[PDB]
Amino acid sequence: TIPHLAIDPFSLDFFDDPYPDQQTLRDAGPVVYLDKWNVYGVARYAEVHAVLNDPTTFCSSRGVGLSDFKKEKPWRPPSLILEADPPAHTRPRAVLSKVLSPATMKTIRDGFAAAADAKVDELLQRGCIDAIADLAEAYPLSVFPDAMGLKQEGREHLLPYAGLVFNAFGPPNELRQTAIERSAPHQAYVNEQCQRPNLAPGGFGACIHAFTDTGEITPDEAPLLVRSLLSAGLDTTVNGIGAAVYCLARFPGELQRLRSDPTLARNAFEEAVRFESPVQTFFRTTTREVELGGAVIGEGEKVLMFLGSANRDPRRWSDPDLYDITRKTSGHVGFGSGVHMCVGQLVARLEGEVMLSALARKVAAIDIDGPVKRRFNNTLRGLESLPVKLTPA
Numbered sequence: 606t607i608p609h610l611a612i613d614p615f616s617l618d619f620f621d622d623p624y625p626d627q628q629t630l631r632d633a634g635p636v637v638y639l640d641k642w643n644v645y646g647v648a649r650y651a652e653v654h655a656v657l658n659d660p661t662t663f664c665s666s667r668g669v670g671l672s673d674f675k676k677e678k679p680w681r682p683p684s685l686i687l688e689a690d691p692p693a694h695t696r697p698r699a700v701l702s703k704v705l706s707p708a709t710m711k712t713i714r715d716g717f718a719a720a721a722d723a724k725v726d727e728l729l730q731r732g733c734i735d736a737i738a739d740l741a742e743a744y745p746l747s748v749f750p751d752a753m754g755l756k757q758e759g760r761e762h763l764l765p766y767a768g769l770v771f772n773a774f775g776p777p778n779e780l781r782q783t784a785i786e787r788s789a790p791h792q793a794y795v796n797e798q799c800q801r802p803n804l805a806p807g808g809f810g811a812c813i814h815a816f817t818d819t820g821e822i823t824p825d826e827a828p829l830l831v832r833s834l835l836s837a838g839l840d841t842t843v844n845g846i847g848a849a850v851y852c853l854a855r856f857p858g859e860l861q862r863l864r865s866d867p868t869l870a871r872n873a874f875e876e877a878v879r880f881e882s883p884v885q886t887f888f889r890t891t892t893r894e895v896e897l898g899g900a901v902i903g904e905g906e907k908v909l910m911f912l913g914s915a916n917r918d919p920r921r922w923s924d925p926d927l928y929d930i931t932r933k934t935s936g937h938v939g940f941g942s943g944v945h946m947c948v949g950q951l952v953a954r955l956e957g958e959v960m961l962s963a964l965a966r967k968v969a970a971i972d973i974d975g976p977v978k979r980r981f982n983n984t985l986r987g988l989e990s991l992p993v994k995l996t997p998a
């Protein structure tokens with residue numbers, strides 16, 4: 606009844622060009638079995654959305670990577686938010702929501718926007734730049750660690766730590782094993798920065814610790830919640846901004862529409878998140894036998910959700926393989942959906958908006974002018990290098 610496929614969605618060949626295999630996964634059925642890893646897979650929008658929105662049946666507390674925390678030890682102590690189910694999820698989630706709240710964005714927007722404009726001005730002086738290292742990485746590094754309240758020393762551990770976190774959701778392949786082998790210094794740095802005295806006044810980290818007297822979280826929960834922001838808050842935006850720049854570089858007609866109306870910057874970024882889906886996949890674990898799209902999945906089974914495939918499913922999207930900055934993007938699953946839907950999405954969208962606004966106002970053309978190199982990660986999709994020439998407006 607359920608088709609068995611040999612596709613390895615964590616293989617380098619798959620990462621290099623996932624789109625044919627994602628269509629095969631969608632078209633084989635609403636639910637597939639991936640023999641390579643002994644997991645169920647859902648690649649159509651409808652089933653991905655359904656799984657995300659039933660957290661009781663498709664839980665997160667047994668891990669959102671391949672590993673089942675009921676069977677194996679987690680590689681690090683479980684996240685109090687990502688790897689928790691309601692009701693244990695609810696209070697930590699509320700704290701992060703308030704720390705990253707609509708009102709908090711007002712305090713940081715002016716500085717984030719000035720840093721974006723300054724970065725684009727700097728890049729225009731160079732002309733030919735690497736849109737990854739010099740923009741997608743450099744811009745978030747220039748705003749997010751400071752917004753966290755981190756000291757300067759040791760920030761070089763942040764991107765390695767995030768790459769480790771995202772590789773560790775994958776199966777025990779070479780990418781994951783190698784990341785864990787190299788992890789000790791990055792974990793040591795990150796864990797130390799999560800302690801209250803190491804987080805500067807007014808930043809996200811200090812604000813998390815300040816919530817420890819309201820009854821929502823205790824003091825001993827705050828370090829792990831700071832850890833959540835140091836895990837999820839940087840490399841995601843690197844790949845989101847990188848996706849948006851790569852889209853504008855490949856689709857100059859959309860750059861031209863963005864230049865003509867810079868207020869499209871927020872939706873241009875949202876459409877880049879749908880189009881590239883920098884966060885490609887997450888797992889859930891069934892807590893009971895369940896019927897999903899005509900298939901019967903037993904208890905304690907891992908279900909792999911293809912967020913990027915859901916975001917390209919023609920059953921849901923018109924012209925899904927086109928980058929369209931005026932598309933009605935609401936409902937895409939690039940930030941998830943439901944109770945775990947990205948708690949940092951206002952930060953991510955703020956960064957993406959102000960960078961695309963700076964490009965829309967200052968840049969006339971973005972031309973790829975060197976070899977494009979892809980970066981391979983078990984969960985993140987994005988580029989290692991994107992050589993571009995920026996022409997000033």
Ligand code: HEM
Pocket residue numbers: 665669686687688698701705833834837838839841842844845846878883884887938939940941942944945946947948949950952953
């Ligand atoms: C373009 C950038 C980003 C993308 C595409 C993205 C994507 C996602 C997705 C798909 C989830 C759902 C995970 C699940 O359902 O298991 C998620 C959750 C989460 N994200 Fe984001 N994210 C981004 C940026 C950020 C930022 C900037 C922060 C923090 C400052 C952040 C913090 C979190 C946290 C803490 C969670 C867990 C929420 C929960 O479990 O309730 N993310 N993100």
Ligand SMILES: CCCc1ccc(C(=O)O)cc1
Pocket residue numbers: 684685686687688770832833834836837841884
């Ligand atoms: C796309 C972001 C995924 C993510 C979310 C939360 C955490 C954490 O709570 O440590 C780590 C990774």
Ligand SMILES: [Cl-]
Pocket residue numbers: 681792795796
């Ligand atoms: Cl850790």
